[PDB]
Amino acid sequence: KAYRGGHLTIRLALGGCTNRPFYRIVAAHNKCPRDGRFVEQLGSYDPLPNSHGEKLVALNLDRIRHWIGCGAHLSKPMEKLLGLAGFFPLHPMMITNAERLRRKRAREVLLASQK
Amino acid sequence: PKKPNSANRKCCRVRLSTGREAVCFIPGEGHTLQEHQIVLVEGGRTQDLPGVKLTVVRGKYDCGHVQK
Amino acid sequence: KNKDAVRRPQADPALLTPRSPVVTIMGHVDHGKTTLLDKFRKTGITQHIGAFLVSLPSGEKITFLDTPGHAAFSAMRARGAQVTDIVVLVVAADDGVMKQTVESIQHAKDAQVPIILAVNKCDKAEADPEKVKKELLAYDVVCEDYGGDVQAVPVSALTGDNLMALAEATVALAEMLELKADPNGPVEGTVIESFTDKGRGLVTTAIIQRGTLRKGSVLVAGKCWAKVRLMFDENGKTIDEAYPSMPVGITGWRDLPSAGEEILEVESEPRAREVVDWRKYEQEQEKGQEDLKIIEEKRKEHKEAHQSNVLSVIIKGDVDGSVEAILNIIDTYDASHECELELVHFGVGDVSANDVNLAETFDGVIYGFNVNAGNVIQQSAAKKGVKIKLHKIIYRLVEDLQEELSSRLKTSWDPG
RNA sequence: AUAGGUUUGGUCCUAGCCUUUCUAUUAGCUCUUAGUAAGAUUACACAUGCAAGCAUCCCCGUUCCAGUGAGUUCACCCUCUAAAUCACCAGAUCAAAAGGGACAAGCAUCAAGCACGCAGCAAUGCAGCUCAAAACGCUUAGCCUAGCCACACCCCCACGGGAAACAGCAGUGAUUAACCUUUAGCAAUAAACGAAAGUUUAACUAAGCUAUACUAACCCAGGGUUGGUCAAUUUCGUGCCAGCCACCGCGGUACAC
RNA sequence: CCCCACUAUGCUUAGCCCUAAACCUCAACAGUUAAUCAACAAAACUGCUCGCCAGAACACUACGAGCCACAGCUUAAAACUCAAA
RNA sequence: GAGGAGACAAGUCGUAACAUGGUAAGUGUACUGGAAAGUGCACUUGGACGAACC
Numbered sequence: 001k002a003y004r005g006g007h008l009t010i011r012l013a014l015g016g017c018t019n020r021p022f023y024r025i026v027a028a029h030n031k032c033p034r035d036g037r038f039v040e041q042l043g044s045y046d047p048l049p050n051s052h053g054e055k056l057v058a059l060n061l062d063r064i065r066h067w068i069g070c071g072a073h074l075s076k077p078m079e080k081l082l083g084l085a086g087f088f089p090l091h092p093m094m095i096t097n098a099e100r101l102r103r104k105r106a107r108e109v110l111l112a113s114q115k
Numbered sequence: 116p117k118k119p120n121s122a123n124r125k126c127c128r129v130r131l132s133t134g135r136e137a138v139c140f141i142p143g144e145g146h147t148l149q150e151h152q153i154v155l156v157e158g159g160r161t162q163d164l165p166g167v168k169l170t171v172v173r174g175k176y177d178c179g180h181v182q183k
Numbered sequence: 184k185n186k187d188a189v190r191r192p193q194a195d196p197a198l199l200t201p202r203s204p205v206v207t208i209m210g211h212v213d214h215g216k217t218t219l220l221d222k223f224r225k226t227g228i229t230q231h232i233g234a235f236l237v238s239l240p241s242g243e244k245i246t247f248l249d250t251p252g253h254a255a256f257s258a259m260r261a262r263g264a265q266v267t268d269i270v271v272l273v274v275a276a277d278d279g280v281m282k283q284t285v286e287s288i289q290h291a292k293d294a295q296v297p298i299i300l301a302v303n304k305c306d307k308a309e310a311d312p313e314k315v316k317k318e319l320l321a322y323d324v325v326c327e328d329y330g331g332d333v334q335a336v337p338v339s340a341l342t343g344d345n346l347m348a349l350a351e352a353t354v355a356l357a358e359m360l361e362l363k364a365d366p367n368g369p370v371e372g373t374v375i376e377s378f379t380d381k382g383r384g385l386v387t388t389a390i391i392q393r394g395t396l397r398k399g400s401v402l403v404a405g406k407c408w409a410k411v412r413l414m415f416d417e418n419g420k421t422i423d424e425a426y427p428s429m430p431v432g433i434t435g436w437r438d439l440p441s442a443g444e445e446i447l448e449v450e451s452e453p454r455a456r457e458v459v460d461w462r463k464y465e466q467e468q469e470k471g472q473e474d475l476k477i478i479e480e481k482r483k484e485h486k487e488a489h490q491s492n493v494l495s496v497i498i499k500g501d502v503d504g505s506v507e508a509i510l511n512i513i514d515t516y517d518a519s520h521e522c523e524l525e526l527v528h529f530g531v532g533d534v535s536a537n538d539v540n541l542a543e544t545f546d547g548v549i550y551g552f553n554v555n556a557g558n559v560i561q562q563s564a565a566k567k568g569v570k571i572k573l574h575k576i577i578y579r580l581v582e583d584l585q586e587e588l589s590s591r592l593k594t595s596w597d598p599g
Numbered sequence: 600a601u602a603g604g605u606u607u608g609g610u611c612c613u614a615g616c617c618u619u620u621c622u623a624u625u626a627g628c629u630c631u632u633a634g635u636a637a638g639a640u641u642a643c644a645c646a647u648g649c650a651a652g653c654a655u656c657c658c659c660g661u662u663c664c665a666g667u668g669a670g671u672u673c674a675c676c677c678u679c680u681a682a683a684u685c686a687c688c689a690g691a692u693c694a695a696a697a698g699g700g701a702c703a704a705g706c707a708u709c710a711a712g713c714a715c716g717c718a719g720c721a722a723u724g725c726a727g728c729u730c731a732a733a734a735c736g737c738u739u740a741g742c743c744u745a746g747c748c749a750c751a752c753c754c755c756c757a758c759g760g761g762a763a764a765c766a767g768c769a770g771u772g773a774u775u776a777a778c779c780u781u782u783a784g785c786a787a788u789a790a791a792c793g794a795a796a797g798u799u800u801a802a803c804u805a806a807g808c809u810a811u812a813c814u815a816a817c818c819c820a821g822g823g824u825u826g827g828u829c830a831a832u833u834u835c836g837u838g839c840c841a842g843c844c845a846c847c848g849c850g851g852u853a854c855a856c
Numbered sequence: 857c858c859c860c861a862c863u864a865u866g867c868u869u870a871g872c873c874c875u876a877a878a879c880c881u882c883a884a885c886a887g888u889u890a891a892u893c894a895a896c897a898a899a900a901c902u903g904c905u906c907g908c909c910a911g912a913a914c915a916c917u918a919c920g921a922g923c924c925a926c927a928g929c930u931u932a933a934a935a936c937u938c939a940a941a
Numbered sequence: 942g943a944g945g946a947g948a949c950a951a952g953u954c955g956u957a958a959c960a961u962g963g964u965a966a967g968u969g970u971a972c973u974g975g976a977a978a979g980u981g982c983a984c985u986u987g988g989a990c991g992a993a994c995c
């Protein structure tokens with residue numbers, strides 16, 4: 001389908017079954033469907049803890065670098081995954097959400113102590 | 116029925132949904148298919164009748180099941 | 184295993200709660216019942232039994248069932264009498280007590296419903312309410328004037344005179360009756376009319392009698408079931424609830440229930456489907472017994488042996504009540520000897536390709552009562568030689584039917 | 600195919616038909632639970648509700664997602680090179696238009712098409728080009744499925760006209776053997792927007808209905824068949840009638856009704 | 857069917873017609889007689905090529921097409937039917 | 942409307958075919974006839990001529 005405009009994006013395509021999410025890190029044209037045609041599958045991501053309490057993420061770092069060079073954008077979840085991986089800096093929103101969680105738990109603890 | 120079989124097979128002329136007029140053999144011991152009644156008709160030729168290449172599906176629309 | 188869903192046992196005295204009254208305005212043709220209803224609602228032949236939830240100046244709410252007065256709609260009048268709990272008969276003293284007036288009186292007697300006489304057109308000359316009451320004496324409606332219980336109210340629906348007294352009398356009789364019903368639990372009601380809207384599917388205008396109806400309920404009536412999809416009023420505005428004695432139009436009907444059928448709420452869609460299957464099986468057993476007797480007769484005959492002027496008619500109506508009325512008029516045919524009348528197919532809705540095909544197959548005529556036939560249907564009918572006859576009035580359609588019968592021959596059948 | 604039944608008075612050969620297997624739709628009869636998957640027959644007509652916003656005004660998007668299969672050798676390879684991304688450029692990626700090649704099925708009782716070619720800068724000249732190795736023509740079909748092509752009410756297009764558009768989600772009438780909710784939230788991923796917190800999204804997610812299927816369970820089993828092919832019948836009733844059969848066949852006082 | 861008479865016709869000329877059990881029902885070319893070969897018939901095969909065939913009947917048919925053919929010839933289907941032929 | 946085919950299905954007139962089917966059968970073609978079919982010309986054996994001489 002001849003798309004006007006658009007641009008490559010490295011993003012998560014949701015596969016899996018109901019109640020069982022699973023993501024394929026695919027470098028795809030942004031206008032293309034979420035789970036549709038993709039230029040290249042750069043990795044995978046299982047968001048459910050496995051028997052060892054792990055969320056397995058596989059990042060084809062070489063091709064990810066090649067596509068970032070070739071001019072592909074990064075969706076926010078992919079940016080946060082890379083930030084956790086240390087391939088990127090931690091996302092400003094990850095940091096701010098961590099601080100928000102710290103403040104929220106602090107309020108909860110303070111109220112529990114008071115009551 | 117064609118020889119050697121001998122009987123009086125019950126049949127009905129019906130105008131199918133496709134606009135065609137066909138002859139459907141009515142199975143079962145006894146029926147009450149009167150004129151203007153709506154029936155469902157499936158394939159399967161009655162072997163002893165030449166040209167009667169359909170059968171009324173019992174229990175559907177106005178063709179009640181065979182009384183025991 | 185019997186899976187039928189039956190009406191719940193009569194409500195407990197503690198569970199009982201006051202409810203509105205249900206009033207049917209019966210009477211013979213053109214005695215101003217429609218005018219009286221319009222005046223009460225603050226807003227030339229009736230052909231539909233219409234339910235309206237009116238609010239009186241006192242703040243009370245009353246459900247009025249305006250019924251047709253024509254002789255043809257005896258079924259409609261009987262259904263209205265059965266469903267209602269008060270019959271505000273309307274009689275024009277100038278015209279006097281008539282055949283349909285007496286019919287309504289008998290229906291009220293059967294239903295065991297208090298009757299209130301409203302003398303209509305009392306403004307006009309020659310109006311003799313005393314004579315009206317006298318004549319009613321013969322038909323057992325003993326007005327309070329002649330030492331009785333029936334309240335007679337002189338009114339002039341056109342001029343709106345004494346209607347306040349009529350409403351006051353109705354409210355007083357309602358309070359005396361002390362009508363109450365359980366507002367909670369599975370809903371119970373009766374279908375007042377059923378039809379097919381090209382937008383809203385199969386709809387049924389019913390009157391609730393118990394419990395409260397709400398979107399998402401599962402109802403069963405006759406061989407039909409529904410998941411209540413849209414509850415609407417006379418003006419179509421959606422209503423979130425339908426308390427007892429509330430007229431409500433319910434959408435979401437998988438099949439078009441017969442008029443007057445009982446509607447009962449069941450637990451779930453699978454339970455409703457089980458109930459419908461069981462009822463269809465019961466009907467199948469009954470028809471099977473009939474067919475078994477006929478077949479046994481035929482088979483005995485066969486074993487012992489072994490030892491034209493016909494009018495085919497398709498009927499299409501706007502509502503099931505209208506279709507039933509036309510069917511009764513047809514069944515009153517008695518001149519089969521000179522010409523036979525055959526009813527190929529009856530239904531509710533605009534003339535359809537299936538109706539046209541039946542007409543073509545049986546050389547029939549389509550009679551559409553208050554229904555349309557799109558240009559596509561008209562073109563197909565012209566192509567196939569079918570004749571469509573769209574009538575908006577029952578007696579006009581009956582006249583046309585008689586004319587066709589004579590053309591086939593005048594026809595000896597008198598509708599009466 | 601590991602094949603079987605069937606031509607005949609009988610054998611052999613050829614041969615069609617049917618059986619056995621596996622799926623899918625519909626129908627009859629019947630049905631307990633849980634998880635998942637899939638789900639109008641119709642390019643016929645649509646009530647109603649929603650489905651595209653974002654954002655310090657401009658811009659950007661609403662050309663995407665979603666849908667249907669009417670039409671149908673526009674999909675794949677190469678050449679060239681637009682638009683878009685790479686904060687600017689860089690060449691890199693992506694991929695249009697254009698040009699070259701490849702590209703469904705049947706009908707030859709569709710065998711001729713009738714300008715379908717070339718040269719010249721131009722003027723103009725030559726009379727050529729396709730075709731029995733299937734041209735031209737008719738009918739049918741969405742395809743080669745991480746998805747792709749095509750259509751977007753019809754007039755191929757859409758200035759213009761017909762007319763007032765659900766082939767977006769839910770739903771409806773008609774139609775067919777064929778028939779899912781007129782649910783909830785953007786919490787996750789995707790998209791749009793913004794510098795951003797964030798907002799929006801009938802995409803999607805999580806639910807609703809359906810034995811259509813797979814898995815698991817069930818302490819309440821129905822359906823079909825019982826002459827042979829083909830697992831499997833006791834006694835009655837009927838008596839070439841009623842009836843039964845996928846093929847061979849049965850029923851004239853029955854392991855076939 | 858047997859007997860008699862006689863005509864078109866069989867003959868010559870100039871055109872048409874283009875069908876046969878036109879059959880040796882056995883295609884052309886090259887080659888072998890070795891391990892045979894359903895039956896019968898005129899033994900069985902190998903290589904290569906062209907034409908043709910794919911249940912029976914409808915059917916040397918209808919339509920379409922071509923033809924000096926006008927009750928014709930060539931090509932030639934389908935629908936219904938059967939479990940055989 | 943009429944024809945053609947098929948099937949169903951008992952009749953009517955003959956006995957054309959299967960035996961040398963009582964005139965051997967049939968192909969093409971022509972004329973003729975209720976009807977199969979008859980005859981004319983050529984062709985085939987998918988018939989025979991009894992297989993030493995007599």
Ligand SMILES: Nc1nc2c(ncn2[C@@H]2O[C@H](COP(=O)(O)OP(=O)(O)OP(=O)(O)O)[C@@H](O)[C@H]2O)c(=O)[nH]1
Nearest residue numbers: 212213214215216217218228229253304339340341
């Ligand atoms: N003079 C007078 N006329 C009245 C009065 N009330 C009603 N009418 C008229 O009397 C007639 C009553 O007929 P409707 O009630 O409309 O109809 P109907 O009784 O169903 O009769 P059908 O529909 O023909 O069966 C109408 O013309 C009214 O307007 C009244 O009080 N006085």
Ligand SMILES: [Mg+2]
Nearest residue numbers: 213216217229
């Ligand atoms: Mg009235």
Ligand SMILES: [Mg+2]
Nearest residue numbers: 625626627810
């Ligand atoms: Mg089923």
Ligand SMILES: [Mg+2]
Nearest residue numbers: 668669740741
């Ligand atoms: Mg198509």
Ligand SMILES: [Mg+2]
Nearest residue numbers: 708919920933
């Ligand atoms: Mg042809």
Ligand SMILES: [Mg+2]
Nearest residue numbers: 752764765766
């Ligand atoms: Mg549309």
Ligand SMILES: [Mg+2]
Nearest residue numbers: 751753756757
């Ligand atoms: Mg268009």
Ligand SMILES: [Mg+2]
Nearest residue numbers: 765768769770
């Ligand atoms: Mg929709």
Ligand SMILES: [Mg+2]
Nearest residue numbers: 384771772778
């Ligand atoms: Mg519908």
Ligand SMILES: [Mg+2]
Nearest residue numbers: 624638777778
């Ligand atoms: Mg289905």
Ligand SMILES: [Mg+2]
Nearest residue numbers: 835836852853
């Ligand atoms: Mg016996």
Ligand SMILES: [Mg+2]
Nearest residue numbers: 878879984985
């Ligand atoms: Mg020869």
Ligand SMILES: [Mg+2]
Nearest residue numbers: 875916929969
């Ligand atoms: Mg010939």
Ligand SMILES: [Mg+2]
Nearest residue numbers: 916917928929
């Ligand atoms: Mg011919």
Ligand SMILES: [Mg+2]
Nearest residue numbers: 918919920921
């Ligand atoms: Mg011809």
Ligand SMILES: [Mg+2]
Nearest residue numbers: 956957962963
């Ligand atoms: Mg003979």
